[PDB]
């Protein structure tokens, strides 16, 4: 969309691969305020709003928090306090044509500066001076929208640049889009520290024959102690038992008699620690 008529999209209820865009280096400008891309992946957000518009390379400077520009004032305004990522990649190859693409328009002059995150579609002849425009072309009366030349050989400052700005909104209580979670490999038959769907624990995982229900994730025995969990990847049920623990007792015939001692590990099969079970 044109810069004055910037197009906003709403993205939610999904997993957002912020790393993929961050890892890609094609984009000329990646200015993120109040958030880091690596932090974005772990973070959770209620709703992102992506604004897509084509502007000159010079005007890429204007579209930033705390930046004053004619394009910023009359086309798209960015709040200073706002936290988001501004992404700009050169579009001179595709947008530009030998004749020149003048379809992209921008508001040269407007009666008032646009409020933050506000889009104006008004097409009325701007009125300069005391004399009224009357909606007709005249001296001091000009159409606000102005075309972009966007010639193929145009200077890089004037070259068309496609800019998308991401607006992370945490106002709404659930972080529906939020972000992705990369899962480590599964290991069983060894006492490990596990974190399943935010449920943390320590123990040894093993195959289980008990049958859950399709909607049912984990289980607890009497006294509300976890006994089995479903791993979300392969829809399998795994039994959880705490790894061996117990007391160690020393059997001695008395220092007065001898120096040798024996060690008893209580309730711990010691195949994994003259051994008698």
């Amino acid at each position, epitope marked *: 969309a044109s810069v004055y008529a910037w197009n906003r999209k709403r993205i939610s209820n999904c997993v957002a691969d912020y790393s993929v865009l961050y890892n890609s280096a094609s984009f000329s*400008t990646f200015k993120c305020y109040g958030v880091s891309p690596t932090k974005l992946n772990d973070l959770c957000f209620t709703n992102v709003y992506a604004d897509s518009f084509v502007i000159r390379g010079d005007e890429v400077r204007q579209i930033a928090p705390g930046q004053t520009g004619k394009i910023a004032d009359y086309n798209y305004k960015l709040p200073d306090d706002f936290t988001g990522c501004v992404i700009a990649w050169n579009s001179n190859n595709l947008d530009s044509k030998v004749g020149g693409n003048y379809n992209y328009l921008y508001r040269l002059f407007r009666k008032s500066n646009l409020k933050p995150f506000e889009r104006d579609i008004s097409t009325e002849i701007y009125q300069a001076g005391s004399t009224p425009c009357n909606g007709v072309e005249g001296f001091n009366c000009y159409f606000p929208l102005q075309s972009y030349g966007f010639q193929p050989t145009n200077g890089v400052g004037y070259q068309p640049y496609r800019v998308v700005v991401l607006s992370f909104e945490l106002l709404h209580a659930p972080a529906t889009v939020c972000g992705p979670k990369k899962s480590t490999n599964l290991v069983k038959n060894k006492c490990v520290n596990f974190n399943f769907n935010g449920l943390t624990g320590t123990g040894v995982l093993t195959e289980s024959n008990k049958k859950f229900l399709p909607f049912q994730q984990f289980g607890r025995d009497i006294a509300d102690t976890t006994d089995a969990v479903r791993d979300p990847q392969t829809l399998e049920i795994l039994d959880i038992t705490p790894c061996s623990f117990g007391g160690v007792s020393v059997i001695t015939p008395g220092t007065n008699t001898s120096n040798q001692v024996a060690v008893l590990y209580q309730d711990v099969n010691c195949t994994e620690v003259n051994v008698f079970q």
Partner: nanobody, 131 residues
């Protein structure tokens, strides 16, 4: 005021290693974004490498990926860009640029090869690579 001084440069052999030091006066190096830009003759300057974040995370342009490494020393208030495998295409004048300060802007991550984004510009030093 902010003043940037560029040191290094000059003619080097193909594949040579050369380091450019950007001296910083009047501002803290860590807080402000640091961008090394290359301007070819007759062409607009473009940023080869950037210090994206205050903690020191860095991004490198595909052309200079691996070949160019940028390091910031706060104690000595200087940013050094090390160039390796230098080539005649690489030959151009290199400018040290100061981006907006991370703390004031609130920008954790900031990388921009477009020159207008960086508020302050160093004079720059010519780096030439020839057989």
């Amino acid at each position: 005021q902010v003043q940037l001084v560029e040191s290094g440069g000059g003619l080097v052999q193909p594949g040579g290693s050369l380091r450019l030091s950007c001296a910083a006066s009047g501002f803290t190096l860590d807080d402000y974004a640091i961008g090394w830009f290359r301007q070819a003759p007759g062409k607009e300057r473009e940023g080869v490498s950037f210090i994206t974040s205050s903690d020191g995370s860095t991004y490198y342009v595909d052309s200079v990926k691996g070949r160019f490494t940028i390091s910031r020393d706060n104690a000595k208030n200087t940013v050094y860009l090390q160039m390796n495998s230098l080539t005649p295409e690489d030959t151009a004048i290199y400018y040290c640029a100061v981006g907006p300060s991370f703390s004031y802007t609130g920008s954790t991550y900031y990388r921009s090869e477009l020159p207008w984004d960086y508020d302050y510009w160093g004079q720059g030093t010519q780096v030439t690579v020839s057989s």
